[PDB]
Design a binder for these strands. Structure first.
Ligand SMILES: [Mg+2]
Ligand SMILES: [Mg+2]
Length: 89
RNA sequence: GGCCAGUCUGGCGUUUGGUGACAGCGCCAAGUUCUUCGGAAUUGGGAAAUCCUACUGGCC
């Protein structure tokens, strides 16, 4: 399906491959921006062709809510979303 | 399959650039060429091409 804001992804291509990240912006049907709040923080988020990601069936409500209510997300909240995702899987 | 734009010796490491193939950086190796023997240049196949294998992105 379509990538969603706050969705967890596994990077499959690029030098950041095999890491987990969070979708923080959907440019169009092909390109997104991802960030993990650690080695790739929001202010320098990584542009990605969606075909170079694997969509994981987990969407963080805290990240999605933070964009709706505040228009942005903190690196702290990204790190929490990923750390919480890894614990449940 | 067609069209357009790209990538290149191998291994390990990589908070850097790139959507990506990759590149850059550190280390160990390999091929090619040159050498004043101290070293120097270079890296898919090709003498080379609007050429070709593989691979990457886009359109169909
Ligand atoms: Mg190289
Ligand atoms: Mg193609």
């Amino acid at each position: 399906p379509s990538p969603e804001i706050g969705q967890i992804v596994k990077i499959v291509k690029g030098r950041d491959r095999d890491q987990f990240s969070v979708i923080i912006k959907r440019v169009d049907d092909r390109f997104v921006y991802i960030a993990d709040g650690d080695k790739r923080k929001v202010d320098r988020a990584k542009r990605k062709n969606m075909n170079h990601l694997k969509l994981i069936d987990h969407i963080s409500p805290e990240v999605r809510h933070s964009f709706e209510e505040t228009g942005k997300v903190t690196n702290g909240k990204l790190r929490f979303a990923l750390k919480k995702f890894l614990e449940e899987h």
